[PDB]
Amino acid sequence: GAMGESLSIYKSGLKNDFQDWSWGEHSLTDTTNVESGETNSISFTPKAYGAVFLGCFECIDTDTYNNIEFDINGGSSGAQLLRITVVKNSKSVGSKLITDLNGGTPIEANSWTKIKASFIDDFKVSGKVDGIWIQDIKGDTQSTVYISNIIATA
Ligand code: NA
């Protein structure tokens, strides 16, 4: 197939053997803010440097997928301060601010925004990736965000 490959990580539920390694307070089965055509989202109240961490040891090979993507809803406030981190060889190897990945715009409140990061361009990483995390960097409690359609893409 000439169409670029894709690998679902969360689509109304964990897919393709991805595991919930999160340490922040969150739910994988939120039904209060859900994209049309989905049934659940991941809700995450960013606080105390917690994170939603979806892992699968060496499951994302950059010889097959160039990017990690997800849809995020800023909830009541939008503009959350979050970092996206890629894990390789069981260690964090690079981070980007979500506002940066969003073209320099804080994520909009009460609406869904596509976030895309290139493994090579944004993280300078290649080879086999073990997971991705979305982490609070404020410490102080931020308004809840919702995450949906997490996918690795060629
Ligand atoms: Na909705």
Short mmCIF file of N, CA and C and ligand atoms in Angstrom, two decimals:
data_model
loop_
_atom_site.label_atom_id
_atom_site.label_comp_id
_atom_site.label_asym_id
_atom_site.label_seq_id
_atom_site.Cartn_x
_atom_site.Cartn_y
_atom_site.Cartn_z
N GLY A 1 0.80 -1.21 0.00
CA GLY A 1 0.00 0.00 0.00
C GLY A 1 0.84 1.26 0.00
N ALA A 2 0.54 2.17 -0.94
CA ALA A 2 1.28 3.42 -1.03
C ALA A 2 0.92 4.39 0.08
N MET A 3 -0.25 4.22 0.70
CA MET A 3 -0.63 5.04 1.85
C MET A 3 0.36 4.84 2.99
N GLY A 4 0.67 5.94 3.68
CA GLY A 4 1.58 5.85 4.81
C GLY A 4 1.00 5.00 5.93
N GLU A 5 1.87 4.22 6.56
CA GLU A 5 1.45 3.37 7.67
C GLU A 5 1.05 4.21 8.88
N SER A 6 0.23 3.61 9.74
CA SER A 6 -0.12 4.22 11.01
C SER A 6 -0.33 3.12 12.04
N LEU A 7 -0.10 3.46 13.30
CA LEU A 7 -0.18 2.51 14.41
C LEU A 7 -0.96 3.17 15.54
N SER A 8 -2.18 2.68 15.78
CA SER A 8 -3.02 3.25 16.82
C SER A 8 -2.47 2.91 18.20
N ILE A 9 -2.39 3.91 19.06
CA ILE A 9 -1.94 3.75 20.44
C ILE A 9 -3.10 3.87 21.42
N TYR A 10 -3.94 4.88 21.23
CA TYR A 10 -5.19 4.99 21.98
C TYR A 10 -6.25 5.48 21.02
N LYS A 11 -7.32 4.71 20.86
CA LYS A 11 -8.47 5.09 20.04
C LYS A 11 -9.69 4.56 20.79
N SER A 12 -10.23 5.40 21.67
CA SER A 12 -11.28 4.98 22.60
C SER A 12 -10.86 3.75 23.39
N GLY A 13 -9.59 3.69 23.73
CA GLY A 13 -9.01 2.55 24.42
C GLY A 13 -7.61 2.27 23.91
N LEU A 14 -6.81 1.63 24.75
CA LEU A 14 -5.45 1.28 24.36
C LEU A 14 -5.47 0.24 23.25
N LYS A 15 -4.54 0.38 22.31
CA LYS A 15 -4.48 -0.49 21.15
C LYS A 15 -3.05 -0.97 20.96
N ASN A 16 -2.91 -2.04 20.18
CA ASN A 16 -1.61 -2.52 19.71
C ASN A 16 -0.64 -2.78 20.86
N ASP A 17 -1.17 -3.29 21.97
CA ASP A 17 -0.41 -3.74 23.14
C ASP A 17 0.19 -2.60 23.94
N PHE A 18 -0.22 -1.36 23.69
CA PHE A 18 0.30 -0.26 24.49
C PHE A 18 -0.26 -0.33 25.90
N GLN A 19 0.59 0.00 26.87
CA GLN A 19 0.27 -0.14 28.28
C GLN A 19 0.21 1.22 28.95
N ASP A 20 -0.61 1.32 29.99
CA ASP A 20 -0.77 2.56 30.74
C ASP A 20 0.26 2.57 31.86
N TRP A 21 1.36 3.28 31.64
CA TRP A 21 2.41 3.44 32.63
C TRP A 21 2.35 4.81 33.32
N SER A 22 1.19 5.47 33.26
CA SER A 22 1.05 6.82 33.78
C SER A 22 1.26 6.86 35.29
N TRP A 23 1.79 7.99 35.75
CA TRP A 23 1.87 8.27 37.17
C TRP A 23 1.02 9.44 37.62
N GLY A 24 0.43 10.20 36.69
CA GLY A 24 -0.48 11.26 37.06
C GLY A 24 -1.90 10.76 37.20
N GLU A 25 -2.73 11.58 37.85
CA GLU A 25 -4.14 11.24 37.97
C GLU A 25 -4.80 11.41 36.62
N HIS A 26 -5.52 10.37 36.18
CA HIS A 26 -6.06 10.35 34.83
C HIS A 26 -7.07 9.21 34.75
N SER A 27 -7.88 9.23 33.69
CA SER A 27 -8.77 8.12 33.38
C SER A 27 -8.66 7.81 31.90
N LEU A 28 -8.58 6.52 31.57
CA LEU A 28 -8.61 6.08 30.19
C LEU A 28 -10.01 5.97 29.62
N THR A 29 -11.04 6.21 30.42
CA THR A 29 -12.42 5.98 30.00
C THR A 29 -13.29 7.20 30.27
N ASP A 30 -12.74 8.39 30.06
CA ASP A 30 -13.54 9.59 30.23
C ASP A 30 -14.64 9.64 29.17
N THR A 31 -15.85 9.98 29.61
CA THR A 31 -16.99 10.14 28.71
C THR A 31 -17.56 11.55 28.73
N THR A 32 -16.89 12.50 29.39
CA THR A 32 -17.40 13.86 29.46
C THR A 32 -16.96 14.74 28.30
N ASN A 33 -15.83 14.44 27.67
CA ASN A 33 -15.36 15.21 26.53
C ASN A 33 -14.74 14.21 25.56
N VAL A 34 -15.49 13.87 24.51
CA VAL A 34 -15.17 12.78 23.60
C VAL A 34 -15.35 13.29 22.17
N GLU A 35 -14.38 13.01 21.31
CA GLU A 35 -14.52 13.40 19.91
C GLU A 35 -15.69 12.67 19.28
N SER A 36 -16.34 13.32 18.32
CA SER A 36 -17.37 12.65 17.54
C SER A 36 -16.77 11.42 16.86
N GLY A 37 -17.54 10.34 16.81
CA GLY A 37 -17.01 9.11 16.28
C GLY A 37 -16.11 8.33 17.22
N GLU A 38 -15.85 8.85 18.42
CA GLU A 38 -15.20 8.10 19.48
C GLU A 38 -16.18 7.86 20.63
N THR A 39 -15.79 6.97 21.54
CA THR A 39 -16.59 6.69 22.72
C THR A 39 -15.92 7.06 24.03
N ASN A 40 -14.59 7.20 24.05
CA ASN A 40 -13.89 7.59 25.26
C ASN A 40 -12.71 8.47 24.90
N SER A 41 -12.25 9.22 25.90
CA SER A 41 -11.00 9.95 25.83
C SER A 41 -10.20 9.66 27.09
N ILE A 42 -8.91 10.01 27.06
CA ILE A 42 -8.09 10.03 28.26
C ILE A 42 -8.25 11.41 28.88
N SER A 43 -8.75 11.48 30.10
CA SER A 43 -8.75 12.75 30.82
C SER A 43 -7.56 12.78 31.76
N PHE A 44 -6.97 13.97 31.91
CA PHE A 44 -5.74 14.13 32.68
C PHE A 44 -5.79 15.52 33.29
N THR A 45 -5.80 15.59 34.62
CA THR A 45 -5.70 16.87 35.31
C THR A 45 -4.22 17.11 35.58
N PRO A 46 -3.56 18.00 34.84
CA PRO A 46 -2.11 18.18 35.01
C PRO A 46 -1.82 18.84 36.35
N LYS A 47 -1.05 18.15 37.19
CA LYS A 47 -0.68 18.68 38.49
C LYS A 47 0.47 17.85 39.04
N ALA A 48 1.26 18.46 39.92
CA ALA A 48 2.31 17.76 40.66
C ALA A 48 3.28 17.01 39.76
N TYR A 49 3.43 17.48 38.52
CA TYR A 49 4.37 16.91 37.55
C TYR A 49 3.99 15.48 37.16
N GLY A 50 2.72 15.13 37.33
CA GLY A 50 2.24 13.85 36.86
C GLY A 50 2.21 13.79 35.34
N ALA A 51 2.04 12.57 34.82
CA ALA A 51 2.06 12.39 33.38
C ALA A 51 1.18 11.22 32.97
N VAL A 52 0.65 11.33 31.76
CA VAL A 52 0.07 10.20 31.05
C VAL A 52 1.20 9.61 30.21
N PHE A 53 1.52 8.34 30.46
CA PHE A 53 2.68 7.67 29.87
C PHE A 53 2.17 6.37 29.28
N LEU A 54 2.19 6.27 27.95
CA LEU A 54 1.74 5.07 27.25
C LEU A 54 2.97 4.40 26.67
N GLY A 55 3.19 3.15 27.04
CA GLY A 55 4.45 2.49 26.76
C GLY A 55 4.26 1.16 26.06
N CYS A 56 5.28 0.80 25.30
CA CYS A 56 5.31 -0.47 24.59
C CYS A 56 6.77 -0.64 24.19
N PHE A 57 7.47 -1.53 24.90
CA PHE A 57 8.92 -1.65 24.78
C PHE A 57 9.31 -1.89 23.33
N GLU A 58 10.08 -0.96 22.76
CA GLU A 58 10.63 -1.06 21.41
C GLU A 58 9.55 -1.27 20.34
N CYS A 59 8.32 -0.82 20.60
CA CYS A 59 7.23 -1.14 19.68
C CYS A 59 7.13 -0.19 18.50
N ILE A 60 7.62 1.04 18.64
CA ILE A 60 7.57 2.03 17.56
C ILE A 60 8.97 2.10 16.96
N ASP A 61 9.14 1.56 15.76
CA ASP A 61 10.40 1.66 15.05
C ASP A 61 10.31 2.83 14.08
N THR A 62 11.25 3.77 14.19
CA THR A 62 11.21 4.91 13.27
C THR A 62 11.53 4.53 11.83
N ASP A 63 11.99 3.30 11.58
CA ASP A 63 12.06 2.84 10.19
C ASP A 63 10.69 2.58 9.59
N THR A 64 9.63 2.70 10.39
CA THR A 64 8.26 2.51 9.96
C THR A 64 7.37 3.72 10.22
N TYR A 65 7.63 4.48 11.29
CA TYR A 65 6.81 5.63 11.65
C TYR A 65 7.70 6.84 11.90
N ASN A 66 7.36 7.96 11.26
CA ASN A 66 8.12 9.19 11.40
C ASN A 66 7.64 10.07 12.55
N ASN A 67 6.39 9.92 12.98
CA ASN A 67 5.78 10.91 13.86
C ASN A 67 4.95 10.24 14.95
N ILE A 68 4.75 10.98 16.03
CA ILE A 68 3.75 10.67 17.04
C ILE A 68 2.72 11.79 17.02
N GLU A 69 1.44 11.41 17.05
CA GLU A 69 0.36 12.39 16.96
C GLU A 69 -0.71 12.08 17.99
N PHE A 70 -1.45 13.11 18.37
CA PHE A 70 -2.61 12.93 19.23
C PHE A 70 -3.51 14.15 19.10
N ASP A 71 -4.78 13.96 19.42
CA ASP A 71 -5.72 15.06 19.53
C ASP A 71 -5.84 15.42 21.00
N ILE A 72 -5.85 16.72 21.30
CA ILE A 72 -5.98 17.18 22.67
C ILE A 72 -7.07 18.24 22.75
N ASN A 73 -7.84 18.21 23.83
CA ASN A 73 -8.86 19.21 24.10
C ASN A 73 -8.43 19.97 25.35
N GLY A 74 -8.30 21.29 25.22
CA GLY A 74 -7.86 22.13 26.33
C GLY A 74 -8.86 22.28 27.45
N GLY A 75 -10.06 21.73 27.32
CA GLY A 75 -11.01 21.82 28.41
C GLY A 75 -11.39 23.26 28.72
N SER A 76 -11.66 23.53 30.00
CA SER A 76 -12.25 24.81 30.39
C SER A 76 -11.32 25.98 30.08
N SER A 77 -10.04 25.83 30.36
CA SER A 77 -9.08 26.93 30.27
C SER A 77 -8.27 26.93 28.99
N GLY A 78 -7.96 25.76 28.44
CA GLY A 78 -6.92 25.72 27.43
C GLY A 78 -5.59 26.20 28.02
N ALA A 79 -4.62 26.36 27.11
CA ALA A 79 -3.34 27.00 27.43
C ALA A 79 -2.54 26.26 28.50
N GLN A 80 -2.74 24.95 28.62
CA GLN A 80 -2.00 24.19 29.63
C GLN A 80 -0.52 24.11 29.28
N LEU A 81 0.30 24.11 30.32
CA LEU A 81 1.74 23.96 30.18
C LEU A 81 2.08 22.48 30.32
N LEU A 82 2.44 21.86 29.21
CA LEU A 82 2.67 20.43 29.15
C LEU A 82 3.92 20.18 28.32
N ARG A 83 4.65 19.14 28.67
CA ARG A 83 5.77 18.68 27.87
C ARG A 83 5.48 17.28 27.35
N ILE A 84 5.88 17.04 26.11
CA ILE A 84 5.75 15.73 25.47
C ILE A 84 7.15 15.15 25.38
N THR A 85 7.32 13.94 25.90
CA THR A 85 8.62 13.30 26.01
C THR A 85 8.58 11.96 25.29
N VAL A 86 9.66 11.63 24.58
CA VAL A 86 9.81 10.34 23.92
C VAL A 86 10.81 9.52 24.73
N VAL A 87 10.55 8.22 24.85
CA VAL A 87 11.39 7.32 25.63
C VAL A 87 12.06 6.33 24.68
N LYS A 88 13.37 6.17 24.83
CA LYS A 88 14.14 5.21 24.05
C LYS A 88 15.18 4.58 24.98
N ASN A 89 15.38 3.28 24.84
CA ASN A 89 16.28 2.54 25.73
C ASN A 89 15.95 2.80 27.20
N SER A 90 14.65 2.84 27.50
CA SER A 90 14.13 2.95 28.86
C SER A 90 14.42 4.30 29.51
N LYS A 91 14.78 5.32 28.73
CA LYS A 91 15.09 6.63 29.27
C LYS A 91 14.47 7.71 28.39
N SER A 92 14.08 8.82 29.01
CA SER A 92 13.65 9.98 28.26
C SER A 92 14.81 10.51 27.43
N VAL A 93 14.56 10.78 26.15
CA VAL A 93 15.62 11.22 25.25
C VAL A 93 15.34 12.58 24.62
N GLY A 94 14.23 13.21 24.95
CA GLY A 94 13.93 14.52 24.40
C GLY A 94 12.52 14.96 24.73
N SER A 95 12.32 16.27 24.88
CA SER A 95 11.01 16.81 25.22
C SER A 95 10.72 18.05 24.39
N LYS A 96 9.43 18.30 24.17
CA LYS A 96 8.95 19.51 23.52
C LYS A 96 7.74 20.03 24.27
N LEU A 97 7.62 21.35 24.35
CA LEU A 97 6.41 21.93 24.92
C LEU A 97 5.24 21.75 23.96
N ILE A 98 4.06 21.48 24.51
CA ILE A 98 2.90 21.30 23.65
C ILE A 98 2.59 22.58 22.88
N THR A 99 2.79 23.74 23.52
CA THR A 99 2.57 25.00 22.82
C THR A 99 3.50 25.14 21.62
N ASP A 100 4.74 24.67 21.77
CA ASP A 100 5.68 24.68 20.66
C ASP A 100 5.19 23.79 19.53
N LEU A 101 4.79 22.56 19.85
CA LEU A 101 4.32 21.63 18.84
C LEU A 101 3.08 22.18 18.15
N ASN A 102 2.31 23.02 18.86
CA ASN A 102 1.11 23.65 18.33
C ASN A 102 1.41 24.95 17.60
N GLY A 103 2.60 25.08 17.01
CA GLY A 103 2.95 26.27 16.25
C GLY A 103 3.15 27.52 17.07
N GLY A 104 3.39 27.39 18.37
CA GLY A 104 3.54 28.54 19.24
C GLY A 104 2.25 29.06 19.84
N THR A 105 1.12 28.39 19.58
CA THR A 105 -0.18 28.81 20.07
C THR A 105 -0.56 27.95 21.26
N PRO A 106 -0.95 28.53 22.39
CA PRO A 106 -1.46 27.69 23.49
C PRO A 106 -2.70 26.93 23.03
N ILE A 107 -2.86 25.71 23.54
CA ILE A 107 -3.95 24.88 23.05
C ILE A 107 -5.29 25.52 23.40
N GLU A 108 -6.21 25.48 22.45
CA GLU A 108 -7.48 26.18 22.60
C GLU A 108 -8.36 25.48 23.62
N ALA A 109 -9.15 26.28 24.33
CA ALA A 109 -10.11 25.73 25.27
C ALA A 109 -11.28 25.10 24.54
N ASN A 110 -11.85 24.06 25.15
CA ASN A 110 -13.17 23.54 24.77
C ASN A 110 -13.24 23.14 23.30
N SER A 111 -12.15 22.61 22.76
CA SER A 111 -12.14 22.17 21.37
C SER A 111 -10.95 21.24 21.18
N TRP A 112 -11.02 20.43 20.12
CA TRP A 112 -9.99 19.43 19.85
C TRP A 112 -8.95 19.98 18.88
N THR A 113 -7.68 19.75 19.20
CA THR A 113 -6.54 20.23 18.42
C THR A 113 -5.64 19.06 18.09
N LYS A 114 -5.26 18.94 16.82
CA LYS A 114 -4.28 17.93 16.42
C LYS A 114 -2.88 18.39 16.81
N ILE A 115 -2.15 17.52 17.50
CA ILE A 115 -0.75 17.75 17.84
C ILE A 115 0.09 16.69 17.14
N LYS A 116 1.13 17.13 16.44
CA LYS A 116 2.02 16.23 15.72
C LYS A 116 3.46 16.58 16.05
N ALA A 117 4.27 15.55 16.30
CA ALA A 117 5.70 15.73 16.53
C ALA A 117 6.47 14.73 15.68
N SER A 118 7.52 15.22 15.03
CA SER A 118 8.39 14.37 14.22
C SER A 118 9.50 13.82 15.10
N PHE A 119 9.69 12.50 15.07
CA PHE A 119 10.74 11.90 15.88
C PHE A 119 12.10 12.53 15.57
N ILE A 120 12.44 12.67 14.29
CA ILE A 120 13.76 13.21 13.94
C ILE A 120 13.79 14.73 14.05
N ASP A 121 12.75 15.42 13.57
CA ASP A 121 12.80 16.88 13.50
C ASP A 121 12.63 17.51 14.87
N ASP A 122 11.75 16.95 15.70
CA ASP A 122 11.42 17.55 16.98
C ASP A 122 12.18 16.94 18.14
N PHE A 123 12.53 15.66 18.07
CA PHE A 123 13.19 14.98 19.17
C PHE A 123 14.61 14.53 18.85
N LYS A 124 15.03 14.61 17.58
CA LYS A 124 16.35 14.13 17.17
C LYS A 124 16.55 12.66 17.53
N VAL A 125 15.46 11.90 17.55
CA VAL A 125 15.49 10.49 17.92
C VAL A 125 15.17 9.64 16.70
N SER A 126 15.76 8.45 16.67
CA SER A 126 15.46 7.44 15.67
C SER A 126 15.74 6.08 16.29
N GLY A 127 15.45 5.03 15.54
CA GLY A 127 15.54 3.68 16.08
C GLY A 127 14.24 3.26 16.71
N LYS A 128 14.30 2.44 17.76
CA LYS A 128 13.10 1.92 18.40
C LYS A 128 12.74 2.76 19.62
N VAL A 129 11.49 3.22 19.66
CA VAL A 129 10.97 4.07 20.73
C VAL A 129 10.11 3.20 21.65
N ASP A 130 10.23 3.44 22.96
CA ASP A 130 9.55 2.64 23.98
C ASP A 130 8.24 3.24 24.45
N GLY A 131 7.97 4.50 24.16
CA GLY A 131 6.74 5.12 24.61
C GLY A 131 6.82 6.62 24.54
N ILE A 132 5.70 7.24 24.90
CA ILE A 132 5.59 8.69 24.91
C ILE A 132 4.82 9.10 26.15
N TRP A 133 5.20 10.24 26.72
CA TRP A 133 4.45 10.76 27.85
C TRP A 133 4.10 12.23 27.67
N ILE A 134 3.00 12.62 28.31
CA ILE A 134 2.49 13.99 28.30
C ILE A 134 2.43 14.41 29.76
N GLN A 135 3.26 15.38 30.14
CA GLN A 135 3.56 15.65 31.54
C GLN A 135 3.23 17.09 31.93
N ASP A 136 2.64 17.24 33.12
CA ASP A 136 2.49 18.56 33.73
C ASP A 136 3.86 19.14 34.05
N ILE A 137 4.07 20.40 33.68
CA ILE A 137 5.28 21.12 34.06
C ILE A 137 5.01 22.31 34.96
N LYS A 138 3.76 22.54 35.36
CA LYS A 138 3.40 23.66 36.22
C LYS A 138 3.47 23.33 37.70
N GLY A 139 3.17 22.09 38.08
CA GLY A 139 3.11 21.74 39.49
C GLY A 139 1.76 22.10 40.07
N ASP A 140 1.46 23.39 40.09
CA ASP A 140 0.13 23.85 40.48
C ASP A 140 -0.92 23.22 39.57
N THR A 141 -2.11 22.98 40.13
CA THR A 141 -3.15 22.29 39.38
C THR A 141 -3.59 23.10 38.17
N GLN A 142 -3.63 22.44 37.02
CA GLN A 142 -4.15 23.00 35.78
C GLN A 142 -5.48 22.36 35.46
N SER A 143 -6.27 23.05 34.64
CA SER A 143 -7.55 22.52 34.23
C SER A 143 -7.36 21.25 33.40
N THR A 144 -8.30 20.32 33.57
CA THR A 144 -8.21 19.00 32.95
C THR A 144 -8.14 19.10 31.42
N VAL A 145 -7.30 18.26 30.83
CA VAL A 145 -7.22 18.10 29.39
C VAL A 145 -7.74 16.73 29.01
N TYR A 146 -8.04 16.57 27.73
CA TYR A 146 -8.56 15.32 27.18
C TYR A 146 -7.72 14.95 25.97
N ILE A 147 -7.36 13.67 25.88
CA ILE A 147 -6.45 13.17 24.85
C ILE A 147 -7.13 12.02 24.12
N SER A 148 -6.98 12.01 22.79
CA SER A 148 -7.73 11.09 21.95
C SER A 148 -6.92 10.82 20.69
N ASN A 149 -7.17 9.67 20.08
CA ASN A 149 -6.58 9.32 18.78
C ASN A 149 -5.05 9.49 18.80
N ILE A 150 -4.41 8.84 19.77
CA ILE A 150 -2.95 8.81 19.82
C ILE A 150 -2.48 7.78 18.80
N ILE A 151 -1.56 8.18 17.93
CA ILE A 151 -1.23 7.35 16.77
C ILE A 151 0.19 7.67 16.32
N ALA A 152 0.94 6.64 15.95
CA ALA A 152 2.22 6.81 15.29
C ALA A 152 2.00 6.72 13.79
N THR A 153 2.69 7.57 13.03
CA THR A 153 2.40 7.71 11.61
C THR A 153 3.68 7.80 10.78
N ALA A 154 3.62 7.23 9.58
CA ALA A 154 4.64 7.46 8.57
C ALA A 154 4.42 8.84 7.95
NA NA B 1 -17.84 15.69 22.08
#
